[PDB]
Write an enzyme that holds these catalytic residues in place. Structure first.
Site, PDB file in Angstrom:
ATOM      1  N   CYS A 173      47.984 -52.263 -31.880  1.00 21.55           N
ATOM      2  CA  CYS A 173      47.108 -51.893 -30.756  1.00 21.55           C
ATOM      3  C   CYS A 173      46.643 -53.152 -30.018  1.00 21.55           C
ATOM      4  O   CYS A 173      45.781 -53.937 -30.511  1.00 21.55           O
ATOM      5  CB  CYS A 173      45.943 -51.163 -31.320  1.00 21.55           C
ATOM      6  N   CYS A 199      42.800 -53.759 -29.272  1.00 20.13           N
ATOM      7  CA  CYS A 199      42.035 -54.234 -30.440  1.00 20.13           C
ATOM      8  C   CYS A 199      41.942 -55.745 -30.486  1.00 20.13           C
ATOM      9  O   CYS A 199      40.970 -56.250 -30.973  1.00 20.13           O
ATOM     10  CB  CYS A 199      42.642 -53.756 -31.761  1.00 20.13           C
TER      11      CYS A 199
END
Lengths: 110, 110
Positions: free
Chosen positions: A34, A37
């Site tokens: 991700c 993140c």
């Protein structure tokens, strides 16, 4: 342990450092696939650190901690839960900037 | 190796059954904490099964297979990739109904 920011290592580690925390906690569900993140994670971490023990941050890698994402009904990353005395008191999903994180942390800490 | 639908077990299983596939392949990136994967997964598996080898379906649990998610820039689940002769030729995210899945597979298969 000494640090206000830490990786959750297992279920017991979560029960002790999150559920049984005597300070408010920010739980940051993330994963290495991700992209967002990678912006949020360090941002929040630095701002949590500056509070010098008034809040703690538990980082939870969803891939290493599938149980935890199931229990908290995490369906996307990043997800950050605010927790207090064992319960969820606030949540957001996605990236937030610095002013928004500051507001989020003041609402939690008081 | 008789089933058209299968779980990917590791890196080599992926290179052999997906990259080196002789048929078109639908790669379904899913996880146990993702609600919508429990609708999409079975729906697409059933429709792939009905094609009796004109396409195959490789299921990839993103928590067991983080590396594949990084390589294919999967940022959310469910993500489904269509692949042929080792290349990504189509993609969608989220649930689709049977009419949409049916068009998707006809575009792929021909």
């Amino acid at each position: 342990h000494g640090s206000t920011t830490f990786n959750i290592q297992d279920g017991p580690d979560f029960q002790d450092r999150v559920v049984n925390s005597e300070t408010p906690v920010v739980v940051d569900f993330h994963a290495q696939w991700c992209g967002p993140c990678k912006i949020l994670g360090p941002r929040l971490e630095k701002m949590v650190a500056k509070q010098h023990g008034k809040v703690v941050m538990a980082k939870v890698d969803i891939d290493d901690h599938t149980d935890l994402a199931i229990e908290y009904e995490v369906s996307a990353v990043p997800t950050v839960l605010a927790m207090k005395n064992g319960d969820v008191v606030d949540k957001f999903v996605g990236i937030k900037d610095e002013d928004q994180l500051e507001a989020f942390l003041k609402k939690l800490i008081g």
